[PDB]
Amino acid sequence: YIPYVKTIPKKTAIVGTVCHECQVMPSMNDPNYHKIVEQRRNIVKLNNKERITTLDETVGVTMSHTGMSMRSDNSNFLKVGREKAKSNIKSIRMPKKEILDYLFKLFDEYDYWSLKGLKERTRQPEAHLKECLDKVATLVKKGPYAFKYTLRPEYKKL
Amino acid sequence: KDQDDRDHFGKKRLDLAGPLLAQLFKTLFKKLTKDIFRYMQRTVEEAHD
Amino acid sequence: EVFDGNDIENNETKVYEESLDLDLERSNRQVWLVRLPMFLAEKWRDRNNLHGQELGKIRINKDGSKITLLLNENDNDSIPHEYDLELTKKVVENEYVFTEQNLKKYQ
């Protein structure tokens, strides 16, 4: 057999059995009869669909918004470039003697830390950061934790 | 019964300028929508306006 | 409402506080399957109505063979007040009506 079937239980109850099938039809001898006839005729006579709308304005006025137009778009839709370009922050070269201890505590927090995360956390330029990062740590390129700078074994094995 | 006659004009249809332009416009509009989606993907990915 | 299948661990005892077996107690209840016209169904299947008011009455001849529906005067004199119920199948087999409700998930 199969050990799992993944059923979905629910609360169900049988509350009757059908005995007669009935069709409701308006009586032919009813005073209100032949109103349904008109309604049913209208069901087909009436048409839901409409026609296309034609612009009666001047063609030049209608085309003023097309192509190379003087007016500049004011829409804010899909403004990803604006959204991510507005934010921008830079940092100074604080002396190595402080960021070095900061990096040691960060490494103690975690032992395999990426370059983008390092730039974010230390908030330093890559040019200056690389010198100290190479001086203290090394990058594992072939190991399973590839692309992640890690402290050199000389100081890590302590 | 005999095999259906292929020349029976009742089983034939005449496509006027209406249906022809309809299908041509369908194809062209599908291409236009594809281009719109491509532009959306390009702007979202490459970070353009 | 996803749940285990075979449940050989007897988890239903605590997962559900209600019997999971089909309730075969009201099955002995005569039920009529009635097909209505569009105009009548559009006002009898509405969810913003059916508060328990009297929709009309059913008149059946003593000797049978003829059944009629007499609606009340709530139709706004826009549709017939008298209809005929044509029995498309006097004897009907293998047709039942069942409900569906959720189960308590706690205890």
From Swiss-Prot, chain A:
Localisation: Nucleus
Main location, first listed in the record: nucleus
Biological process annotations from GO: regulation of DNA-templated transcription; RNA polymerase II preinitiation complex assembly; transcription elongation by RNA polymerase II; transcription initiation at RNA polymerase II promoter; transcriptional start site selection at RNA polymerase II promoter
UniProt keyword annotations, A-Z: DNA-binding, Nucleotide-binding, Nucleus, Phosphoprotein, Transcription, Transcription regulation
GO molecular function, one term: nucleotide binding
GO cellular component terms, A-Z: nucleus; transcription factor TFIIF complex
Family per record: Belongs to the TFIIF beta subunit family.
Function description: TFIIF is a general transcription initiation factor that binds to RNA polymerase II. Its functions include the recruitment of RNA polymerase II to the promoter bound DNA-TBP-TFIIB complex, decreasing the affinity of RNA polymerase II for non-specific DNA, allowing for the subsequent recruitment of TFIIE and TFIIH, and facilitating RNA polymerase II elongation.
Misc: Present with 520 molecules/cell in log phase SD medium.
Assembly and oligomerization: TFIIF is composed of three different subunits: TFG1/RAP74, TFG2/RAP30 and TAF14.
Protein name: Transcription initiation factor IIF subunit beta
Originating species: Saccharomyces cerevisiae (strain ATCC 204508 / S288c)
Curated annotation (Swiss-Prot), chain B:
Subcellular location field: Nucleus
Domain of life: Eukaryota
Subunit structure of this chain's protein: Component of the RNA polymerase II (Pol II) complex consisting of 12 subunits.
Protein family: Belongs to the RNA polymerase beta chain family.
General remark: The binding of ribonucleoside triphosphate to the RNA polymerase II transcribing complex probably involves a two-step mechanism. The initial binding seems to occur at the entry (E) site and involves a magnesium ion coordinated by three conserved aspartate residues of the two largest RNA Pol II subunits. Present with 18700 molecules/cell in log phase SD medium.
Section covered of the full-length record: 393 to 441 of 1224
Its biological purpose: DNA-dependent RNA polymerase catalyzes the transcription of DNA into RNA using the four ribonucleoside triphosphates as substrates. Second largest component of RNA polymerases II which synthesizes mRNA precursors and many functional non-coding RNAs. Proposed to contribute to the polymerase catalytic activity and forms the polymerase active center together with the largest subunit. Pol II is the central component of the basal RNA polymerase II transcription machinery.
Protein name per Swiss-Prot or TrEMBL: DNA-directed RNA polymerase II subunit RPB2
